Design an enzyme around this catalytic site. Structure first.
Site, PDB file in Angstrom:
ATOM      1  N   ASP A  64       0.884  -1.288   0.044  1.00  0.00           N
ATOM      2  CA  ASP A  64       0.020  -0.022  -0.012  1.00  0.00           C
ATOM      3  C   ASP A  64       0.862   1.333  -0.057  1.00  0.00           C
ATOM      4  O   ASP A  64       1.228   1.770   1.022  1.00  0.00           O
ATOM      5  CB  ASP A  64      -0.897   0.019   1.211  1.00  0.00           C
ATOM      6  CG  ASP A  64      -2.068   0.956   1.191  1.00  0.00           C
ATOM      7  OD1 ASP A  64      -1.947   2.118   0.602  1.00  0.00           O
ATOM      8  OD2 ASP A  64      -3.168   0.839   1.893  1.00  0.00           O
ATOM      9  N   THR A  65       0.990   2.179  -1.136  1.00  0.00           N
ATOM     10  CA  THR A  65       1.726   3.399  -1.362  1.00  0.00           C
ATOM     11  C   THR A  65       1.200   4.405  -0.755  1.00  0.00           C
ATOM     12  O   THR A  65       1.721   5.273  -0.241  1.00  0.00           O
ATOM     13  CB  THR A  65       1.835   3.385  -2.849  1.00  0.00           C
ATOM     14  OG1 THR A  65       0.915   3.634  -3.358  1.00  0.00           O
ATOM     15  CG2 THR A  65       2.861   2.372  -3.432  1.00  0.00           C
ATOM     16  N   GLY A  66      -0.186   4.335  -0.405  1.00  0.00           N
ATOM     17  CA  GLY A  66      -0.950   5.274   0.371  1.00  0.00           C
ATOM     18  C   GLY A  66      -0.765   5.303   1.817  1.00  0.00           C
ATOM     19  O   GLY A  66      -1.167   6.448   2.262  1.00  0.00           O
TER      20      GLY A  66
END
Ligand SMILES: CC(C)[C@H](NC(=O)N(C)Cc1ccccn1)C(=O)N[C@@H](Cc1ccccc1)[C@H](O)[C@@H](O)[C@H](CC1CCCCC1)NC(=O)[C@@H](NC(=O)N(C)Cc1ccccn1)C(C)C
EC number: 3.4.23.16
Lengths: 99, 99
Positions: free
Chosen positions: A25-27
């Site tokens: 998850d880059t967010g």
């Protein structure tokens, strides 16, 4: 490996001697895992998300093996709907976004 | 371009004739933007995440230009703490994760 995003970017991780599937998850600033058994001391912490805040237990310097790559960092454990591997660990395994 | 993750993966997007900064989020199925002015019909929808759920307005077939790449898709608008570009649009700009 290179991962396209037509499906959820799930990988297998090993932490606390247990196997789990987690979302790359880059967010997410942090890594949060569903309720699980981890050893050691932990502190209470609150993290925010799309629908509000949840209380979790914070474990520092935890070893995690993500898709074959080892990393040590902070892991949060609490009522998350899914296991999330956030940027604090993604950077350690050399994960990048490309387009 | 290639983006490392030591910092939040923010990009500039143009939507509804307005400029905004948004998070490239591999963990999100959908794209959700803070309250803003969009034209056309919309359908009330409910999305979840960490902390629970929020009610948003669903706009379909919305043109969005992310860091210079055009894409048409569904965009949700509501009380999100930050603009999120989810996989429904990331796939359209050919975004991939690499490690
Ligand atoms: C895990 C949390 C510690 C994390 N929070 C932070 O990092 N914060 C508060 C600091 C910050 C501030 C500003 C900018 C960036 N970061 C988080 O919840 N990150 C989500 C994005 C986000 C960031 C800021 C405010 C609100 C939201 C996370 O990165 C998203 O990918 C999130 C992941 C999701 C997976 C499983 C269900 C709970 C968490 N996606 C969503 O919340 C998304 N929900 C889904 O995509 N769902 C429910 C479908 C789904 C199910 C399972 C797996 C993947 N997707 C919403 C529509 C936006």
């Amino acid at each position: 490996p290179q991962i396209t995003l037509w499906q959820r970017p799930l990988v297998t991780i090993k932490i606390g001697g247990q196997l789990k599937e987690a979302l790359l998850d880059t967010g997410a600033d942090d890594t949060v895992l569903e309720e699980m058994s981890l050893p050691g001391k932990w502190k209470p912490k609150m993290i925010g998300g799309i629908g509000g805040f949840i209380k979790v237990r914070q474990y520092d310097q935890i070893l995690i093996e993500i898709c074959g790559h080892k990393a040590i960092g902070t892991v949060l454990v609490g009522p998350t709907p899914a296991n999330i591997i956030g940027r604090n660990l993604l950077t350690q395994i050399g994960c990048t976004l490309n387009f």
